[PDB]
């Protein structure tokens, strides 16, 4: 019973999170059967602090799918966006 939520983060100057998972990754601490990308840490006073939470699964960023991608590709993409990052996340209600 999850839902897809759209969250806008304004880099200031970063997003303010750490992520894990991906194809060929070593899993994640939330859903071990899922090779997707998960938020593992959010800076407490950072740009994502009232918007994202550990456990969120990132499935899209500025229109780019995060399904079936490797962690390195997700990291490079998120770092390359300069300002607005519009995420679709899957979150437990």
């Amino acid at each position: 019973g999850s839902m897809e939520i759209r969250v806008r983060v304004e880099k200031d100057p970063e997003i303010g999170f750490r992520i894990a998972g991906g194809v060929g990754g070593r899993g994640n601490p939330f859903r071990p059967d899922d090779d997707g990308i998960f938020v593992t840490r959010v800076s407490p006073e950072g740009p994502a602090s009232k918007l994202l939470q550990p456990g969120d699964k990132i499935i899209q960023a500025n229109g780019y799918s995060f399904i079936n991608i490797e962690l390195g590709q997700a990291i490079s993409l998120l770092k390359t966006f300069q300002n607005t990052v519009e995420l679709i996340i899957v979150r437990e209600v």
């Binding site: 750490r18 894990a20 070593r26 593992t40 990291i75």
Partner: peptide, 7 residues
């Protein structure tokens, strides 16, 4: 598991 650095 492997965590990215901060971004």
């Amino acid at each position: 598991y492997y965590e990215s650095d901060w971004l």
